[PDB]
């Protein structure tokens, strides 16, 4: 059981919760397979073949849009997500604001970079991403940044220890929690995130404000810039995430 859920008396604080979410995702997946074939018709058939080998979509997420249903089908990293483990259904993770979504995305760019014993050659990766927004509403929600649970915010926002939040996630899952907000562990402005246990949290049928982004990942920073309109880059140094010269991960 979760000590944080036994304390705080979590069941007493379950209440309806609403809001919007922002999520930054990669594009170029379809561009990738278009390089393997000759025609768009061959690429469409290949994408159908690739779909058949993927983990199945949970039955309740199938009628959703592709960008809303996909997070529910794949397992997380082997060390689990912050509030979910490899053996439980994956959660839909997003941020409440765009700048928090970029911080979480920049951190996992550093995670990919730091996994390789030898850093990527040329010391720069130019990739393309897309952000979208969506409304969510649940009748059984929890605010982990709220006074009852914020007494454990140090253990909930730990940079390289998932045990306490992962046990809290299983305890909320069994208690019927449908979605919950929490303090981001990576956002330097202390923005809040939101996680959805069930695809029924989504109010709308289609993701909104789809925006392409250009991403630049180096050994020292991750930068984001709109791909379709004039803008200035938003820079995320590795110093936002490094602890003792090393990138933390569980």
């Amino acid at each position: 059981p979760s000590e944080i859920w036994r304390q705080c008396k979590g069941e007493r604080h379950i209440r309806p919760l609403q809001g919007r979410l922002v999520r930054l995702v990669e594009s170029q997946e379809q561009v990738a397979t278009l390089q393997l074939v000759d025609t768009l018709e061959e690429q469409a058939l290949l994408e159908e073949l690739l779909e058949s080998s993927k983990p199945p979509v949970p039955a309740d997420a199938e009628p959703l849009h592709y960008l809303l249903k996909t997070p529910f089908r794949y397992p997380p990293l082997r060390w689990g997500s912050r509030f979910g483990r490899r053996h439980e259904p994956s959660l839909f993770y997003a941020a409440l604001k765009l700048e928090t979504a970029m911080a979480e995305s920049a951190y996992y760019r550093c995670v990919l970079w730091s996994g390789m014993v030898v850093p990527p050659p040329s010391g720069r990766i130019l990739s393309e991403h897309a952000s979208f927004e969506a409304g969510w509403k649940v009748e059984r929600g929890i605010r982990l940044q709220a006074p009852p649970f914020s007494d454990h915010e140090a253990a909930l926002t730990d940079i390289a220890d998932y045990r306490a939040p992962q046990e809290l996630g299983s305890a909320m899952r069994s208690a019927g929690v449908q979605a919950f907000e929490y303090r981001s562990a990576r956002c330097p402005e202390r923005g809040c995130n939101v996680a959805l246990f069930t695809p029924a949290a989504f109010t709308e049928k289609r993701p909104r404000n789809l925006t392409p982004w250009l991403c630049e990942t180096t050994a020292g920073y991750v930068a984001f810039k709109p791909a379709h309109v004039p803008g200035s880059p938003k820079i995320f140094s590795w110093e936002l995430f490094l602890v003792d010269g090393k990138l933390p991960h569980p």
Binding site: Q35, L49, I125
Partner: protein, 127 residues
């Protein structure tokens, strides 16, 4: 009026086995894999690879499923690394802290291939 002009005689219906064979050989070349390295991932001999160009790779086979997973590895790597070929190849042939070792060596076995693919899927935004 004239919607039939493009509703037909411009749309082709390609074979699934020929598309899979074409895609897995192109993924082999882009990732810089040899024929024997490809043979060890999907589990065939180099002679059977030479039949894919004339016969195709049957999708209903376990050989084809492993080829689908291999293409998804290229597909995730391309999106993660922006299509930069030298970085995608570097990832496969460099020891990795998060994986059990060098990804290309891991993909030589079934459980390692799934391990590499699941890592690349989960580290993507869209998870």
């Amino acid at each position: 009026d004239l919607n039939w002009i493009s509703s037909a005689l411009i749309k082709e219906r390609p074979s699934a086995d020929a598309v899979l064979a074409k895609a897995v050989l192109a993924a082999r070349e882009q990732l810089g894999l040899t024929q024997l390295e490809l043979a060890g991932i999907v589990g065939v001999d180099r002679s059977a690879i030479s039949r894919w160009k004339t016969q195709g790779l049957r999708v209903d086979s376990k050989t084809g499923e492993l080829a689908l997973l291999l293409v998804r590895v290229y597909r995730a790597l391309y999106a993660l690394f922006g299509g930069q070929q030298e970085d995608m190849r570097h990832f496969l042939r460099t020891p990795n802290h998060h994986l059990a070792g060098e990804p290309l060596a891991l993909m030589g076995q079934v459980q390692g291939l799934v391990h590499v693919l699941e890592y690349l899927d989960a580290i993507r935004g869209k998870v």
